[PDB]
Amino acid sequence: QPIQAQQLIELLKVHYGIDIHTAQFIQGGADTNAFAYQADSESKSYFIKLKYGYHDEINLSIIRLLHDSGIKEIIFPIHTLEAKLFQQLKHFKIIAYPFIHAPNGFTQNLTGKQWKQLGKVLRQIHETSVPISIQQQLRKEIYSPKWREIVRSFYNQIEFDNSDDKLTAAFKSFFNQNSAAIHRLVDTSEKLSKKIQPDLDKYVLCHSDIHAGNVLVGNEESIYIIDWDEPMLAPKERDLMFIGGGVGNVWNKPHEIQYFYEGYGEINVDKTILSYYRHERIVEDIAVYGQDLLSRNQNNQSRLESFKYFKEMFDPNNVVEIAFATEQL
Ligand SMILES: Nc1ncnc2c1ncn2[C@@H]1O[C@H](COP(=O)(O)OP(=O)(O)O)[C@@H](O)[C@H]1O
Ligand SMILES: CN[C@@H]1[C@H](O)[C@H](NC)[C@H]2O[C@]3(O)[C@H](O[C@@H]2[C@H]1O)O[C@H](C)CC3(O)O
Ligand SMILES: [Mg+2]
Ligand code: NI
Numbered sequence: 627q628p629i630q631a632q633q634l635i636e637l638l639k640v641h642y643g644i645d646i647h648t649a650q651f652i653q654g655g656a657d658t659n660a661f662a663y664q665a666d667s668e669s670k671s672y673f674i675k676l677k678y679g680y681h682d683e684i685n686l687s688i689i690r691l692l693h694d695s696g697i698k699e700i701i702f703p704i705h706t707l708e709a710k711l712f713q714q715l716k717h718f719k720i721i722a723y724p725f726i727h728a729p730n731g732f733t734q735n736l737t738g739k740q741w742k743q744l745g746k747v748l749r750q751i752h753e754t755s756v757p758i759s760i761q762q763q764l765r766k767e768i769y770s771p772k773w774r775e776i777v778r779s780f781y782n783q784i785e786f787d788n789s790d791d792k793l794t795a796a797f798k799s800f801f802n803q804n805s806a807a808i809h810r811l812v813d814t815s816e817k818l819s820k821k822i823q824p825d826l827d828k829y830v831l832c833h834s835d836i837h838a839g840n841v842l843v844g845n846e847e848s849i850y851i852i853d854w855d856e857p858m859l860a861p862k863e864r865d866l867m868f869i870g871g872g873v874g875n876v877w878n879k880p881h882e883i884q885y886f887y888e889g890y891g892e893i894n895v896d897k898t899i900l901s902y903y904r905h906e907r908i909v910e911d912i913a914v915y916g917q918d919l920l921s922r923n924q925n926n927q928s929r930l931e932s933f934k935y936f937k938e939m940f941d942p943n944n945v946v947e948i949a950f951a952t953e954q955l
């Protein structure tokens with residue numbers, strides 16, 4: 627909600643030379659730095675992002691590399707009048723894209739054919755060669771204990787309190803009920819991290835967060851991998867962990883996993899790194915949701931979501947049960 631309709635309209639007119647007659651702010655949003663609007667002209671619809679991050683230029687750098695590489699399953703930004711993929715403004719950055727109406731994977735299942743196409747495209751991304759100038763700017767997999775420590779710092783905080791409101795209490799209670807599994811996730815991630823032999827030579831370009839929510843499933847063959855904010859250099863397992871990973875209660879049907887590899891190309895998958903990620907990723911979520919639900923912070927309009935998502939992870943056939951089900955790797 628930084629600017630208003632008629633304010634974005636002028637900014638798009640001045641910097642993009644586009645004549646928009648209607649623009650609406652969109653809900654959801656990543657949070658903090660991340661606003662999204664739908665702006666329409668007489669003939670087209672645009673999806674506008676007003677970012678406030680730092681890596682936006684290096685990430686645009688990655689889709690620029692992917693577009694050069696011939697990957698069509700990505701939404702290429704719209705050029706500013708200065709031939710740039712983004713317009714640097716006073717306090718924020720503008721990034722326009724054409725508007726894609728397809729629903730994400732949490733709502734639309736992929737057909738066997740689309741599953742093959744996703745495997746084919748992920749392989750393409752992984753096989754993509756990255757210029758050393760970009761590799762030096764991309765974060766690398768260093769198996770940081772950062773999130774495991776934060777979750778542990780929670781261990782000794784889940785105790786009855788009078789200052790906590792209903793939400794905080796319900797969270798501590800839920801935490802206590804699943805304390806065993808929570809420690810197991812942290813311990814298994816820590817354990818597996820030491821069992822892994824870091825071989826920088828086997829690191830490929832990874833999306834790092836390619837679950838169903840980051841896939842727009844259009845008609846057919848018109849699917850799109852979005853959310854290119856965390857690309858990194860790491861083992862391919864960083865991304866393969868999602869196939870059959872169960873994020874969002876989908877992508878948890880074993881028979882689709884084969885459809886996927888049909889296009890990715892059945893190859894050797896390190897079952898240990900693949901298991902590490904499935905555990906570590908949940909540890910990260912526990913840590914992020916945990917901090918939000920404990921800080922108490924009033925401006926936390928997110929606590930509601932954080933709690934819902936937190937518990938969502940422990941549901942039947944969701945990410946926790948799938949990570950624990952080693953026989954699925
Ligand atoms: N080009 C686009 N056109 C239409 N909707 C889009 C477009 N890009 C993203 N979206 C919508 O926004 C949602 C979140 O996008 P994403 O890039 O993952 O942002 P965030 O990192 O905040 O989750 C997607 O589920 C989709 O509904
Ligand atoms: C910054 N990336 C996002 C964060 O990691 C976020 N957790 C703080 C993730 O939450 C999720 O893992 C998944 O993907 C979300 C990620 O895309 O998004 C779902 C809506 C909720 C989830 O629990 O299923
Ligand atoms: Mg997303
Ligand atoms: Ni193109």
